[PDB]
Scaffold this active site. Structure first.
Site, PDB file in Angstrom:
ATOM      1  N   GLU A   7      69.718  34.391  -5.771  1.00 49.23           N
ATOM      2  CA  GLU A   7      70.293  35.411  -5.647  1.00 49.23           C
ATOM      3  C   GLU A   7      69.535  36.828  -6.307  1.00 49.23           C
ATOM      4  O   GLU A   7      69.351  37.725  -5.551  1.00 49.23           O
ATOM      5  CB  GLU A   7      71.709  35.684  -5.994  1.00 49.23           C
ATOM      6  CG  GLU A   7      72.535  36.923  -6.026  1.00 49.23           C
ATOM      7  CD  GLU A   7      74.069  36.706  -6.040  1.00 49.23           C
ATOM      8  OE1 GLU A   7      74.803  36.069  -5.326  1.00 49.23           O
ATOM      9  OE2 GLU A   7      74.316  37.097  -7.382  1.00 49.23           O
TER      10      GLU A   7
ATOM     11  N   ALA B 145      75.364  20.585   1.009  1.00 53.77           N
ATOM     12  CA  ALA B 145      76.538  19.757   0.375  1.00 53.77           C
ATOM     13  C   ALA B 145      75.998  18.894  -0.440  1.00 53.77           C
ATOM     14  O   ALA B 145      75.898  17.822   0.128  1.00 53.77           O
ATOM     15  CB  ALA B 145      77.535  19.353   1.729  1.00 53.77           C
TER      16      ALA B 145
ATOM     17  N   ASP C  74      77.015  29.552   1.764  1.00 57.97           N
ATOM     18  CA  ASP C  74      77.662  28.542   1.093  1.00 57.97           C
ATOM     19  C   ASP C  74      78.782  27.459   1.579  1.00 57.97           C
ATOM     20  O   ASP C  74      79.286  27.992   2.558  1.00 57.97           O
ATOM     21  CB  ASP C  74      78.527  29.016   0.088  1.00 57.97           C
ATOM     22  CG  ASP C  74      77.593  29.770  -1.214  1.00 57.97           C
ATOM     23  OD1 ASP C  74      76.330  29.755  -1.214  1.00 57.97           O
ATOM     24  OD2 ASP C  74      78.230  29.995  -2.278  1.00 57.97           O
ATOM     25  N   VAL C  75      78.883  26.079   1.184  1.00 62.34           N
ATOM     26  CA  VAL C  75      79.907  25.351   1.701  1.00 62.34           C
ATOM     27  C   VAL C  75      81.116  25.435   1.076  1.00 62.34           C
ATOM     28  O   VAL C  75      82.310  24.966   1.866  1.00 62.34           O
ATOM     29  CB  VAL C  75      79.307  23.949   1.422  1.00 62.34           C
ATOM     30  CG1 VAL C  75      79.392  23.486   0.103  1.00 62.34           C
ATOM     31  CG2 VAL C  75      79.914  22.822   2.523  1.00 62.34           C
TER      32      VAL C  75
ATOM     33  N   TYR D 165      79.935  18.797  -3.691  1.00 61.90           N
ATOM     34  CA  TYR D 165      80.042  19.721  -2.647  1.00 61.90           C
ATOM     35  C   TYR D 165      80.474  19.059  -1.224  1.00 61.90           C
ATOM     36  O   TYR D 165      80.638  19.837  -0.438  1.00 61.90           O
ATOM     37  CB  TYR D 165      79.133  20.881  -2.890  1.00 61.90           C
ATOM     38  CG  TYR D 165      79.295  21.710  -3.948  1.00 61.90           C
ATOM     39  CD1 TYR D 165      79.269  21.276  -5.412  1.00 61.90           C
ATOM     40  CD2 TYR D 165      79.805  23.141  -3.823  1.00 61.90           C
ATOM     41  CE1 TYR D 165      79.311  22.184  -6.480  1.00 61.90           C
ATOM     42  CE2 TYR D 165      79.612  23.935  -4.848  1.00 61.90           C
ATOM     43  CZ  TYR D 165      79.706  23.554  -5.976  1.00 61.90           C
ATOM     44  OH  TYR D 165      79.850  24.387  -7.109  1.00 61.90           O
TER      45      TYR D 165
HETATM   46  O1  LIG Z   1      75.969  29.806 -10.345  1.00 61.66           O
HETATM   47  C1  LIG Z   1      74.779  30.546 -10.172  1.00 61.66           C
HETATM   48  C2  LIG Z   1      74.573  30.825  -8.544  1.00 61.66           C
HETATM   49  O2  LIG Z   1      75.460  32.026  -8.197  1.00 61.66           O
HETATM   50  C3  LIG Z   1      75.448  32.294  -6.864  1.00 61.66           C
HETATM   51  O3  LIG Z   1      76.182  31.039  -5.992  1.00 61.66           O
HETATM   52  C4  LIG Z   1      74.050  32.787  -6.455  1.00 61.66           C
HETATM   53  O4  LIG Z   1      74.178  33.164  -4.967  1.00 61.66           O
HETATM   54  C5  LIG Z   1      72.994  31.797  -6.629  1.00 61.66           C
HETATM   55  O5  LIG Z   1      71.623  32.156  -6.655  1.00 61.66           O
HETATM   56  C6  LIG Z   1      73.067  31.262  -8.200  1.00 61.66           C
HETATM   57  O6  LIG Z   1      72.636  32.351  -9.244  1.00 61.66           O
HETATM   58 MN   LIG Z   2      79.873  29.350  -3.448  1.00 61.63          MN
END
Ligand SMILES: OC[C@H]1O[C@H](O)[C@H](O)[C@@H](O)[C@H]1O
Ligand SMILES: [Mn+2]
Ligand SMILES: O=c1ccn([C@@H]2O[C@H](COP(=O)(O)OP(=O)(O)O)[C@@H](O)[C@H]2O)c(=O)[nH]1
Ligand SMILES: O=c1ccn([C@@H]2O[C@H](COP(=O)(O)OP(=O)(O)O)[C@@H](O)[C@H]2O)c(=O)[nH]1
Ligand SMILES: O=c1ccn([C@@H]2O[C@H](COP(=O)(O)OP(=O)(O)O)[C@@H](O)[C@H]2O)c(=O)[nH]1
Ligand SMILES: O=c1ccn([C@@H]2O[C@H](COP(=O)(O)OP(=O)(O)O)[C@@H](O)[C@H]2O)c(=O)[nH]1
Ligand SMILES: OC[C@H]1O[C@H](O)[C@H](O)[C@@H](O)[C@H]1O
Ligand SMILES: [Mn+2]
Lengths: 268, 268
Positions: B226, B53, B134-135, B57
């Protein structure tokens, strides 16, 4: 390269393919063997196969071994361990590369007792999984690394469609194998189970120790070591379950719709 | 006591529930949580949850933690690890028994780098699994021990129905994240992955080391960590895959027929 999985297409619409504790139930159409073969060859997986051939059952070894060479774990390292009271009657079957056979002279409790003693021996240091099967059987189709997991049992072919109250579990509470009428996931047959060496050490020790308790108490479970195997796999649930493709009797039960393949079948 | 499994009834007729390498794909109706809760409580399972965070965030933490207390791993041991550049902005949310929160001050590569460094620390000796999310999300329904396994990823909600050529994998061969057009099982999102501590050490080290190679080479993968997570889970296939129940955006994608439950959902 291989086909992409289809998230929105069920592998099967006619059978359960995963148990309620998330163990795969292995049927044809639920696995791509090319992916699994690569995973297990990267670990140089070695599979030990135990089979008992005592008294007249030495007669079954020739077809058992010939058909295992055509269909069991081909391409992987395999070691057969033949437990027998007649070592000279073991047929000399020619084996593929990377495959070996040892004869162990013996030597109701015998199978669990003997697999327990054997599974603890340091000469298994190289073996990763043990598969324990009946000898009065033949392989007719692929039996491979899709079965390997820490602990597995196989659905008995006479009972896969049965409700649990019809299962022939041990029902006397004075037996270590006892299972109440309202408990049980599946009825597993004693004729095909296995897992990693450690999980097979654990299962066979527990079943042998339970059988020795019942003997001291003057009780013999209704289906002997299969009753103890079912109590054990109720309390220690298997990480895969093999469908009856892996343990079938065609003379008794035919070739039903839900069986796409008959892999390992009873000999008359 | 619980319902007997139904061998001749499919858990689902509308979705794939097991991958072709026999990893369960976790959807509602494929598990009985009462069985899994007992298995994992018998091992006194402890689950660590990492969340980042940073900057604005921090605003998402209050609902993230409040809703995790209602729905994540309730009844099990949980330790939250909040990575943040603003420790005073961490809301003081009241936690259930057996649940703790630590604040780790930080401190494109950051998440993989930081989870790698952290996952190797001896203060995780008691933690069995790490879950990395993710948060900007909230829990709306059960997320529990059915997800735990040595290694898992989650199907991205925008791509579960897509063919692989449409997946937004890294397609430049000069990147460590490269995946050819004819390869790939699924498109996993970076927003929910995990596994045992050892498998999360391995995944995050490999992704961080690959990201450092691409940086040295003046390349940044199309979707950053990702893209690297997808290359890693192609070569090291996960032992369970979470369906998009576990990572959903209702504003974007509604409540489709194949989703019986919306468990962990994007916040606008
Ligand atoms: O905003 C770009 C991001 O989008 C997703 O949250 C993804 O999981 C991350 O690796 C990054 O590519
Ligand atoms: Mn997210
Ligand atoms: O849900 C499924 C569907 C298929 N497969 C396996 O993946 C491979 C290819 O499947 P496909 O149905 O595409 O067969 P093809 O029509 O290409 O011969 C075969 O080994 C199938 O048994 C699988 O593991 N799960
Ligand atoms: O006289 C015997 C009886 C049994 N068996 C072994 O024990 C296994 C199980 O016995 P059986 O097939 O009679 O019972 P089920 O039913 O399985 C057989 O496959 C053989 O491997 C043997 O070797 N000699
Ligand atoms: O193929 C299945 C069917 C059901 N269940 C789970 O087992 C429990 C009981 O299932 P049942 O369909 O019998 O539900 P009931 O009608 O008793 O409420 C629930 O947690 C189901 O999600 C499962 O894991 N696999
Ligand atoms: O300024 C930022 C940007 C991202 N994040 C963290 O990184 C995660 C992934 O970023 P984002 O949700 O923007 O990408 P996606 O797509 O997942 C967020 O959930 C936060 O946990 C953060 O803490 N501060
Ligand atoms: O003939 C009786 C035997 O029947 C099966 O082979 C069963 O698996 C054994 O445990 C034993 O009960
Ligand atoms: Mn038999």
């Amino acid at each position: 390269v291989y086909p992409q999985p289809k998230v929105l297409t069920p592998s099967r619409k006619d059978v359960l393919v995963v148990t309620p504790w998330l163990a795969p139930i292995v049927w044809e159409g639920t696995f791509n063997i090319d992916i699994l073969n690569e995973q297990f060859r990267l670990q140089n997986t070695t599979i030990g196969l135990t089979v008992f051939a005592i008294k007249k059952y030495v007669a079954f070894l020739k077809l058992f071994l010939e058909t295992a060479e055509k269909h069991f774990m081909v391409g992987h390292r395999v070691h057969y361990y033949v437990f027998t009271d007649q070592p000279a009657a073991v047929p000399r079957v020619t084996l593929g590369t990377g495959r070996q056979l040892s004869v162990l002279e013996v030597g109701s409790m015998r199978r669990m007792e003997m697999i327990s003693d054997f599974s603890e021996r340091r000469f298994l240091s190289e073996v990763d999984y043990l598969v324990c099967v009946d000898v009065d059987m033949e392989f007719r189709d692929h039996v491979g690394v899709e079965i390997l997991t820490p602990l597995f049992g196989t659905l008995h072919p006479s009972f896969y469609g049965s409700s649990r109250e019809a299962f022939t579990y041990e029902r006397r509470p004075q037996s270590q194998a006892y299972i109440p009428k309202d408990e049980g996931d599946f009825y597993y047959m004693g004729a095909f189970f296995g897992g990693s060496v450690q999980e097979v050490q654990r299962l066979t020790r527990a079943c042998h120790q339970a059988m020795m308790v019942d003997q001291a108490n003057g009780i013999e479970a209704v289906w002997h070591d299969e009753s103890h195997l079912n109590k054990y796999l109720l309390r220690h649930k298997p990480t895969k379950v093999l469908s009856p493709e892996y343990l079938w009797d065609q003379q008794l039960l035919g070739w039903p719709a839900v069986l796409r393949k008959l892999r390992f079948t009873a000999v008359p």
